[PDB]
Design a binder for this molecule. Structure first.
Ligand SMILES: CC(C)C[C@H](NC(=O)[C@@H](O)[C@@H](N)Cc1ccccc1)C(=O)O
Ligand SMILES: [Zn+2]
Ligand SMILES: [Zn+2]
Ligand SMILES: [Zn+2]
Ligand SMILES: [Zn+2]
Ligand SMILES: [Zn+2]
Ligand SMILES: [Zn+2]
Length: 412
């Protein structure tokens, strides 16, 4: 049965999809993402699919024009967290540890600037916990090398300007403060803006067309069509979109007894907003009938490692079972592990079996201007299309679903 898939997986088609999409970054809610939505819609239609476009709004963030951080007189390097309010305050710097509700409860942060170490809780809670105590600004320092780049999740007037700094420059201040030194700091954040944007999810569905063998099962195959600022997003995630489109094309040539929904989600980089919106559109019946959701994210880089399947809880499910089965016949052992960070999380949250298919360890180009077309491997795109497509087909082909017993290891 795999031959029905492997003989039709066109790597040139997939390469071409990535070439068109990665001509420029596709920031969620931007004209470029809209352009991608129209392109994807048109390709699905060309395969003969009926397509639906689900719109949704979300709070976008415009980075501040300038982030000025100063300890007394010396100027330090700091990057304002996304969704960070604006500020122009100069006051005493107070170390409050991890910024837990307790760490700040015993301290006097009224009108002062809090110094918080990254860890345990989310950056959002730290800023929130410190702001509730009267803190006018927050300085968070790294746990590892390199700048501290994070997000407060989304807009929230309960926040106060928050900027991150390295571990070295952070442990130093914390030490000086612990030693009893009285330090003053300046946190000026200007330019930052929050705006309401509109993104979209593209949904192409193939209804079962088998004889009396039709089931009421549903399988979802997804990827996200947006990319981060400044990143052409060839592999993250035009690659996933390319495989999603090609598999949709492949399946249109075959009879199926299982409803297939090929979807490209918007605003994934903003917090899986698109997939959360689509998941919220499903009825209780659709939820219980969805036997599996396959997420394709970063599946074409020549500079990434072997293919692996990630599940939210690190446990095996119907999707990893099918993925493992297909791979055992086509390429060998396909390991599984625990990881979220992608659209599969949105379906796992509803109890639907789900897994992320990705090449790990990931390439160094991830989220950089270097995530381009010349890093893409047609051979890997084709292999993923072969494995995921055969796994889906093992279920979608006419007849009853049978999954033979096979062992596949968990990899951390
Ligand atoms: C909650 C999400 C915004 C998480 C976010 N996800 C992404 O960027 C996706 O494009 C995925 N590429 C996340 C990812 C990266 C590397 C290995 C596994 C999973 C991320 O920061 O990784
Ligand atoms: Zn092929
Ligand atoms: Zn629209
Ligand atoms: Zn991604
Ligand atoms: Zn990403
Ligand atoms: Zn080769
Ligand atoms: Zn192949």
């Amino acid at each position: 049965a795999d031959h029905q898939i492997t003989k039709r997986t066109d790597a040139e088609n997939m390469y071409n999809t990535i070439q068109f999409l990665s001509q420029a970054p596709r920031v969620a809610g931007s004209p470029e993402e809209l352009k991608a939505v129209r392109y994807i819609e048109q390709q699905f239609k060309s395969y003969g699919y009926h397509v639906e476009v689900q719109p949704f709004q979300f709070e976008g963030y415009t980075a501040p024009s300038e982030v000025t951080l100063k300890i007394g007189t010396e100027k330090k390097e700091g990057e304002a967290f996304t969704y960070s309010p604006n500020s122009d305050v100069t006051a005493e710097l107070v170390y409050v540890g991890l910024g837990t509700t307790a760490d700040v409860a015993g301290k006097d942060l009224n009108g002062k600037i809090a110094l918080i170490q990254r860890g345990n809780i989310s950056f959002a809670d730290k800023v929130r916990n410190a702001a509730k105590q009267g803190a006018k600004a927050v300085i968070i320092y790294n746990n590892t090398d390199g700048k501290l780049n994070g997000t407060l999740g989304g807009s929230d007037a309960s926040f106060v300007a928050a900027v991150g700094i390295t571990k070295q420059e952070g442990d130093a201040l914390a030490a000086n403060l612990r030693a009893g030194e009285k330090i003053t700091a300046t946190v000026k954040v200007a330019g930052a803006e929050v705006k309401t944007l509109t993104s979209h999810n593209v949904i192409a569905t193939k209804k079962p067309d088998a004889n009396k063998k039709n089931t009421n099962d549903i399988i979802i195959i997804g990827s996200h069509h947006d990319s981060v600022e400044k990143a052409p997003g060839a592999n993250d995630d035009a690659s996933g979109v390319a495989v999603t489109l090609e598999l949709a094309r492949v399946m249109s040539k075959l009879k199926t007894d299982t409803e297939l929904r090929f979807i490209t989600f918007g605003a994934e980089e903003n917090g899986l907003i698109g997939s959360k919106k689509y998941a919220a559109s499903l009825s209780e019946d659709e939820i219980k009938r969805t036997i599996g959701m396959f997420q394709l994210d970063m599946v074409g880089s020549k500079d990434a490692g072997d293919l692996i399947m990630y599940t939210i809880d690190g446990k095996k499910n119907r999707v990893t079972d099918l993925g493992a089965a297909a791979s055992s016949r086509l390429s060998g052992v396909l390991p599984y592990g625990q990881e979220g960070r992608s659209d599969h999380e949105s379906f796992h949250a509803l109890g639907i079996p789900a897994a992320l298919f990705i090449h790990a360890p990931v390439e160094p180009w991830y989220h950089t201007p270097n995530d381009t077309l010349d890093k893409i491997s047609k051979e890997k795109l084709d292999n993923v299309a072969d494995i995921v497509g055969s796994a889906v087909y093992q279920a979608a082909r006419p007849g009853e679903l049978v999954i033979e017993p096979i062992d596949y290891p968990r990899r951390n």
